[PDB]
Design a protein that fits this description.
Strand content of chain A: 15-25%
Number of strands of chain A: 8
Order of helices and strands of chain B: EEEHEHEHEHHHHHHHHEHHEHH
Entry title: Time resolved structural analysis of the full turnover of an enzyme - 6788 ms
Shape of chain B: globular
Chain A: Fluoroacetate dehalogenase
Strand content of chain B: 15-25%
Number of domains of chain B: 1
Oligomer: heterodimer
Order of helices and strands of chain A: EEEHEHEHEHHHHHHHHEHHEHH
Radius of gyration of chain B: 17 Å
CATH class of chain A: Alpha Beta
PDB class: hydrolase
CATH architecture of chain B: 3-Layer(aba) Sandwich
Shape of chain A: globular
Largest sheet of chain B: 8 strands, mixed
Helix content of chain B: 40-55%
Number of helices of chain A: 15
Keywords: time-resolved, catalysis, hydrolase
Number of domains of chain A: 1
Structural class of chain B: alpha/beta
Strand order of the largest sheet of chain B: 1-2-4-3-5-6-7-8
CATH superfamily of chain B: Alpha/Beta hydrolase fold, catalytic domain
Largest interface: A-B, 26 and 25 residues
Radius of gyration of chain A: 17 Å
CATH superfamily of chain A: Alpha/Beta hydrolase fold, catalytic domain
Assembly: dimeric
Structural class of chain A: alpha/beta
Largest sheet of chain A: 8 strands, mixed
């Protein structure tokens, strides 16, 4: 009873070696892959992907393990939910469609996959936009009292299983709603289309989906940080022209000035704040869409 | 619920903020023992009888914990700040005629204890803190490693009712998880099952969990600000003090505890105990030994 929020978009179940990636696919022109983050699914793009689809073949995919994508079984190192792995799996998915070179915009966890993709396999990306993130390394390196309080869930969801899972399972609805709400500008759910919230809530209702989210966060604390650490200590920069968009009241701007940070990671980065909380494409769809269209159309 | 303090009486000590529950036994100089999170006074059940051979031992539930009353909190978590708990415990000791006493605290109770020593050092003959560094030091050393290790310092201090609602998701699991994961063994085998039942029952009460959260909210806000002012004015604890910490405890995950405490205390003695976080229960003999030696 989940709404179809991408009227006119097709649906694809893309097989990869790590499981099927679900995607809505619409538009035509150059391929643009949109990746959501937590605690969301591909439908968070539903307000901007139509605009995007006027100019691009828009592929709106659920991350590995999220939404209707399959859930690779994780391991002690949370390997399939490391951004490196997810990027490789999304690269595979895109190859299934014939897209070996594509534009990529990610938000939140999807943005982490995206900049990791761009570090690991920059030849896959024409351009990269990341929405309301700094690299995982930067969040962890900026993890002082103020920021540990702000993004407590980085520590909490990365606790060994089954601790987050057990607590999240008592009232999953509360938690997904709380995160959605608290990272918006308003502090409530009013930015979101209720039909979109239903998608998030239903995804969150599945204990396996929750586990995957924790795995994602577990990777975010461990391997993802390690991978980032290697690159930043090696001076490895993303060579792909990139856009860093962040919400003026989003999470990234709370750790540090986002463009300063990103210029350390990317040799060709432009940046813009958007008056918005974390959920740029739902809180600020027009502004987001326009920034992405302008960037990817250059 | 077992009586783990045979021969101790049980007193309800009135204060202006509510009743403090305490087991009291022994005779001789008063020694107040304060537990921490997520426990209650019975955490002292293995060490208290040895202390009671030489001291009047008051084994108190912190304000809001165990069987002590829960003062209503406020937007600043005032009653659950260590300053406010210290004040309430001083008042409770005064009700017993104890205006000058020895104090040992573990975890949250040790935070009350050193804040007590900073605020009202005339109240204390000697002080022992078990497996803590000052709250300021945990937050100042906040980084990736410590954020993951003491994630609950950020989690429990999130605004209500988020931790409350989460904790309510599986309270029996959480408290056993807290207890197990901070031990050397990594399971509950160091605890007396009857003590665990005490811990489980207190944590089963949502209002009790709320207070624990209020304590941690205090830990993140007011307690840190109070500590900062002492750091920034150079105030040191002038009370002879013993810092004990588990070789695999929380305190040493942040820094070398004795060198930390030397910054906070003029007269600090220190020793690592072969244990995780729950010194009196994992390492009852070594812990009691050190406390007796120190306080006598």
């Amino acid at each position: 009873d989940l709404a179809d929020l991408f009227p006119g978009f097709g649906s694809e179940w893309i097989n990869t070696s790590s499981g099927r990636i679900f995607a809505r696919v619409g538009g035509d022109g150059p391929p643009l892959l949109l990746l959501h983050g937590f605690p969301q699914t591909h439908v968070m793009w539903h307000r901007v992907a139509p605009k995007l689809a006027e100019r691009f073949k828009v592929i709106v995919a659920d991350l590995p393990g999220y939404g209707w994508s399959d859930m690779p079984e994780s391991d002690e190192q949370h390997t399939p939910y490391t951004k490196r792995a997810m990027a490789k799996q999304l690269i595979e998915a895109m190859e299934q469609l014939g897209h070996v070179h594509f534009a990529l915009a990610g938000h939140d966890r999807g943005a982490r996959v995206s900049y990791r993709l761009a570090l690991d396999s920059p030849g896959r990306l024409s351009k990269l936009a990341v929405l309301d993130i700094l690299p995982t390394y930067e969040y962890w390196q900026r993890m002082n009292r103020a920021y540990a309080l702000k993004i407590y869930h980085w520590s909490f969801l990365a606790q060994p299983a089954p601790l987050p899972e057990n607590l999240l399972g008592g009232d999953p609805d509360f938690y997904v709603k709380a995160k959605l709400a608290s990272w918006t500008r308003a502090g409530d759910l009013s930015a979101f289309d209720p039909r979109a919230v239903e998608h998030y809530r239903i995804a969150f209702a599945d204990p396996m989906r929750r586990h995957v989210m924790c795995e994602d966060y577990r990777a975010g604390a461990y391997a993802d940080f390690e991978h980032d650490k290697i690159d930043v200590e090696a001076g490895n920069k993303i060579p792909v022209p990139m856009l860093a968009l962040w919400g003026a009241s989003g999470i990234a701007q709370s750790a540090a000035t986002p463009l300063d940070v990103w210029r350390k990671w990317a040799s060709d980065v432009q940046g813009a704040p958007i008056e918005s909380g974390h959920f740029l494409p739902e809180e600020a769809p027009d502004q987001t869409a326009e920034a992405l269209v302008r960037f990817f159309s250059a």
